[PDB]
Design an enzyme around this catalytic site. Structure first.
Site, PDB file in Angstrom:
ATOM      1  N   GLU A 357      45.562  40.073  30.655  1.00 20.05           N
ATOM      2  CA  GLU A 357      45.751  38.719  31.843  1.00 20.05           C
ATOM      3  C   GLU A 357      47.410  37.731  31.352  1.00 20.05           C
ATOM      4  O   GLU A 357      48.151  37.419  31.835  1.00 20.05           O
ATOM      5  CB  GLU A 357      44.602  37.759  31.090  1.00 20.05           C
ATOM      6  CG  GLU A 357      43.463  38.772  31.721  1.00 20.05           C
ATOM      7  CD  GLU A 357      43.743  39.337  33.167  1.00 20.05           C
ATOM      8  OE1 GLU A 357      43.836  38.455  34.175  1.00 20.05           O
ATOM      9  OE2 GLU A 357      43.522  40.686  33.150  1.00 20.05           O
ATOM     10  N   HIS A 487      39.069  51.403  48.290  1.00 21.06           N
ATOM     11  CA  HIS A 487      40.692  50.919  49.316  1.00 21.06           C
ATOM     12  C   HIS A 487      40.598  51.898  50.216  1.00 21.06           C
ATOM     13  O   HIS A 487      41.600  52.849  50.523  1.00 21.06           O
ATOM     14  CB  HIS A 487      41.900  51.613  48.472  1.00 21.06           C
ATOM     15  CG  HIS A 487      41.577  50.584  46.433  1.00 21.06           C
ATOM     16  ND1 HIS A 487      41.737  49.298  46.617  1.00 21.06           N
ATOM     17  CD2 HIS A 487      40.693  50.617  45.704  1.00 21.06           C
ATOM     18  CE1 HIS A 487      41.885  48.387  45.234  1.00 21.06           C
ATOM     19  NE2 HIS A 487      41.164  49.465  45.031  1.00 21.06           N
TER      20      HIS A 487
END
Ligand SMILES: *[C@@H]1O[C@H](CO)[C@@H](O)[C@H](O)[C@H]1NC(C)=O
Lengths: 596, 198
Positions: A357, A487
């Site tokens: 992150e 997806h």
């Protein structure tokens, strides 16, 4: 009047509003994600609607500009994005139907309800529930049943909508001077700028097959190993004549083989490297996790965190009614503002997640001086590689011992490293054959060379050919298995997960070459080396201002898509794998099935 | 409490008083004190006639644009600093009085101009800027843009997007009956000793 000069005023007036409008948009999104309450749901919707209405106003006028005479390569690229027609090229009765189908697909995809027939009141969902059944269990009559139940009640309703969705999306793409809808997804992997660095959309289709054959022996060896390991536990269900079955990979779709690591361990005497209790014994909070790990970014020369990140962004401890989303995210709100949204805990996996992150945060800060239309990377396959570089090169025993978390008497042997090399191999190259499968499948189905009837037959005959997954139960043409994917229904491209693997190892080897490291590649680190901080910085700050092919020259030796490091990183893995399948046949035949 | 805008800056004329360039140099709440001319510690040595003060409210790291011979968007057509600058520029942090929660859009800056500004000139008139040969002939249209855009100010913009109030002081070095001076000396007194008195 003049046409080249006047565009500068338009792009200098548009981005000024775009930057701060996106700033309030990001702030509203962060507020909604931090505060799960109905009191913070109207503002984000209003901001999104306002930004959407503002984007269309500034993109309609950017067609009168003749983007064939502008001299500069920066303003032309900036205005090319504004020149995109988007989805506003269809009829309103047609666009409304297309949007309705797009929303309906996503809504239905999250409504999986399958009840056990003998107890009709007990259904399970794709969330925790049916997911746990195949995630950790030791049974054969239930794993196939869960697979069949999941894939026989979700596809029969997504298929009718997807049938029209594909045709309508292809028709919409036809209006943008593209042969198919594949050009709409390959448009970012194309550059027509500086001579010698040019690229074409027709090059990637032939370049994706010329980089996958050189890693196929590795997949054959790994498949032989996992089949041999499965023959040692499961009863006489798997056969050496064919290949490994479908409902034993460890997941519904088989994307990741992380659940098979325990079942396919070479030696069980030696445990894995765990330091979570090492941090717990010293009473480390989540703030010390962010403080002791940021220092790895300082020794390499990268810039320090700006003030405000330690105050505005929440680090951990949701605790009471103040509930927040725990999905690990990094937010670049704009105006120099960066935040993190994570429920950090005491975990080495959480340590890697925090590294990932703040790597996203660093990458976002790298090109903060770029204009709003250029506040992104050259292509979208760079963010994950940047995030995962330190995730890969932050779990080495030397790195942990340097911090002071393990005793200096550690005595790692070869087998201690073989398991660490295998754990990452089962995850990394275990998903590559499933990406070249789905992405090429979608590309060819959007090309339209196959008729309506011959849709599902090719998928199973090609899955056995390359990946080697046999049909556990027979299915007819009306079934729709791939529609049960994230997806596939939300119009998400599945090529960003394939070049990421190449980018990660290319960057790792390139940085390890000029870092005074000799020997293997799994035990290479760039800590305490500023020389590894100068080569990387010349590319991170470029953003979208330069093509990705050009950007792949100042950090790496070559620009070409050649998979060198994957044949070099797992060199001990190959050396040990070539000695285990001495008498076991390696390969498969596309004729054997469990039912026939 | 309030300062003038950067596009239309205030002009303060100070004269006929004792100049005190001591507390200004000694205060620690001054993010920028670098300036070109006489020494900042030798200021209380010369005597001048007029002192000019200009106040601006700008956004963060943009403050570096105010220099004798720097270009940009504030030093080219918003406020032209003379090349032979004989004053000093002081900038400090003003995130506590200029930033408001939700945005403070009451500090407009000019963004469109047809020619670079000469030193010490003001353009306070607001007219729609034409880019080409398309007069608006109305209120708004195509090739129509407003030069003045309001700055955005919130308490949390980091470092490079925070408001930073700036004061520029111009001293004129003309030959005249100068009056503006400073405290010279306060030396003690002795008696009945052969000394040099001034
Ligand atoms: C956040 O949600 C709480 C209730 O969960 C509410 O009291 C509060 O007003 C909301 N907004 C902020 C800024 O806390």
């Amino acid at each position: 009047s003049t046409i080249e000069e006047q565009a500068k005023t338009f792009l200098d007036k548009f981005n000024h509003e775009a930057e701060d409008l996106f700033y309030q948009s990001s702030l509203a999104s962060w507020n909604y994600n931090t505060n799960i309450t109905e009191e913070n749901v109207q503002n984000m919707n209003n901001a999104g609607d306002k930004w959407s209405a503002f984007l269309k106003e500034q993109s309609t006028l950017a067609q009168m500009y003749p983007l064939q005479e502008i001299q500069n390569l920066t303003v032309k690229l900036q205005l090319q994005a504004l020149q995109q027609n988007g989805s506003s090229v269809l009829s309103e009765d047609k666009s409304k139907r297309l949007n309705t189908i797009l929303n309906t697909m996503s809504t239905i995809y999250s409504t999986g309800k399958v009840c056990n027939p003998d107890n009709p009141q007990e259904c399970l969902l794709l969330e925790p529930g049916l997911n746990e059944i195949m995630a950790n269990s030791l049974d054969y009559n239930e794993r196939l049943w869960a697979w069949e139940s999941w894939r026989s009640e979700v596809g029969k309703q997504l298929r009718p909508l997807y049938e029209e969705y594909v045709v309508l999306k292809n028709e919409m793409a036809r209006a943008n001077h593209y042969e198919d809808y594949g050009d709409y997804w390959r448009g970012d992997y194309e550059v027509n700028g500086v001579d010698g660095y040019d690229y074409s959309r027709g090059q990637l289709i032939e370049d994706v097959e010329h980089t996958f054959e050189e890693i196929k022996p590795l997949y054959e060896h790994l498949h032989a190993y996992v089949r041999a390991k499965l023959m040692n536990a499961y009863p006489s269900y798997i056969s050496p004549i064919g290949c490994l079955p479908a409902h034993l990979l460890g997941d519904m779709w088989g994307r990741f083989w992380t659940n098979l690591y325990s079942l396919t361990v070479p030696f069980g005497q030696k445990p894995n490297i765990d330091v979570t209790d090492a941090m717990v014994d010293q009473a480390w909070d989540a703030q010390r996790i962010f403080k002791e790990a940021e220092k790895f970014f300082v020794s390499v020369g990268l810039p320090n965190m700006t003030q405000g990140f330690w105050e505005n962004s929440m680090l951990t401890d949701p605790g009471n009614v103040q509930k927040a989303v725990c999905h690990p995210t990094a937010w670049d709100l704009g105006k120099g503002d960066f935040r993190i949204l994570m429920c950090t805990k005491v975990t080495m996996d959480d340590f890697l997640t925090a590294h990932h992150e703040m790597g996203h945060i660093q990458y976002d800060m790298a090109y903060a001086a770029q204009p709003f239309l250029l506040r992104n990377g050259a292509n979208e396959g760079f963010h994950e590689a940047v995030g995962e570089i330190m995730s890969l090169s932050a779990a080495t025993p030397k790195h942990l011992k340097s911090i002071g978390l393990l005793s200096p008497d550690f005595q790692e042997d070869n087998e201690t490293e073989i398991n660490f090399l295998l754990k990452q191999a089962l995850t990394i190259v275990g998903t590559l054959p499933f990406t070249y499968m789905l992405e090429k499948w979608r590309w060819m189905v959007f090309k339209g060379e196959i008729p309506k009837d011959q849709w599902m037959k090719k998928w199973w005959e090609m899955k056995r050919e390359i990946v080697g997954v046999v049909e556990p139960v027979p299915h007819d043409e009306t079934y729709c298995d791939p529609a049960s994917l994230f997806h596939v229904s939300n119009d998400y491209s599945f090529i960003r997960y394939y070049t990421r693997t190449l980018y990660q190892f290319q960057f790792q080897e390139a940085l390890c070459q000029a870092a005074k490291h000799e020997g293997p590649l799994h035990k290479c680190d760039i800590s305490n080396s500023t020389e590894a901080g100068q080569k990387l910085f010349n590319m991170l700050r470029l953003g979208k201002s330069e093509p990705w092919t050009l950007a792949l020259e100042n950090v790496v030796g070559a620009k070409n898509m050649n998979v060198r490091p994957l044949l070099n990183y797992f060199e001990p893995l190959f050396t040990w794998l070539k000695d285990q399948n001495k008498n076991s046949f390696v390969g498969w035949s596309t004729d054997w099935s469990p039912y026939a | 409490t309030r300062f003038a805008s950067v596009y239309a800056w205030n002009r303060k004329r100070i004269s006929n008083c004792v100049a005190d360039y001591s507390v200004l140099y000694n205060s620690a709440s001054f993010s920028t004190f670098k300036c070109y001319g006489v020494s900042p510690t030798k200021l209380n040595d010369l005597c001048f006639t007029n002192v000019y003060a200009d106040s601006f409210v700008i956004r963060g790291d943009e403050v570096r644009q105010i220099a004798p011979g720097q270009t940009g968007k504030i030093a080219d057509y918003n406020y032209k600093l003379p090349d032979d600058f004989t004053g000093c520029v002081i900038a400090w942090n003003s995130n506590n009085l200029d930033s408001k929660v939700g945005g403070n859009y009451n500090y407009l800056y000019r963004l469109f101009r047809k020619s670079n500004l000469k030193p010490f000139e003001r353009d306070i008139s607001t007219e729609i800027y034409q880019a080409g040969s398309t007069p608006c002939n109305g209120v708004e249209g195509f090739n129509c843009y407003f030069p003045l855009q309001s700055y955005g100010f919130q308490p949390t913009y980091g470092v490079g997007y925070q408001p930073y109030r700036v004061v520029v002081l111009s001293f004129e070095l003309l030959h005249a009956p100068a009056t503006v001076c400073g405290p010279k000396k306060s030396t003690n007194l002795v008696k009945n000793k052969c000394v040099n008195f001034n």
